[PDB]
Amino acid sequence: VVGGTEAQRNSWPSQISLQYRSGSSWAHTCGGTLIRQNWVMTAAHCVDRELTFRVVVGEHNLNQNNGTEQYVGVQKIVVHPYWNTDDVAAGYDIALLRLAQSVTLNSYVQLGVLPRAGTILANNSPCYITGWGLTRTNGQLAQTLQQAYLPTVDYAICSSSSYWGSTVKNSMVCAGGDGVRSGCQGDSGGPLHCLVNGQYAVHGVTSFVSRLGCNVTRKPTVFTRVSAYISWINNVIASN
């Protein structure tokens, strides 16, 4: 997250760190949202690589023991069947991971609230992105979980010529674009949390930023729209 502030430890308890095995250690690669005690929602593109993955819940600082983490292997990966790795702009950037164990809930580990199917946020709705992704374009991952305030940009505006044009679809949410704050590499797969009727819900799964840079004016961060996939998510959880 570029232009973020450090999140409080208990603000976003559904955020997870998706990590892969790197020699004798583990490296953060993407975020995710814990949606059941044994299921995580993330981006399809995060799991294209044929890597060994694990999930960390209750994580705050990737580089120090927080005394709250639970580490769990990924047992099954279900990518949306219309996902095409050669075409992020087509959408379908969503995947569900069944965890090898059910995690234990507490102040640091909670299920993410999902929006009702079909919900579309009004332009300029209040949301936060969270994650450990780069803190600058071509920078480095955050140590501590970051958050940034990114108001939505509705479809008519986001898909206009000076923004994302045809690249953005109605199955996506755009947020931000102020030139200062944004998602960045490493935030992919994590939540966009938006306040609706007094309750934060996870309306987006972080998907992509401009090839030109993370914080680019009129290139808001783009998220898979969670409320476009409620039926798909329920069907996967019910059949697995």
Ligand SMILES: [Ca+2]
């Ligand atoms: Ca830690």
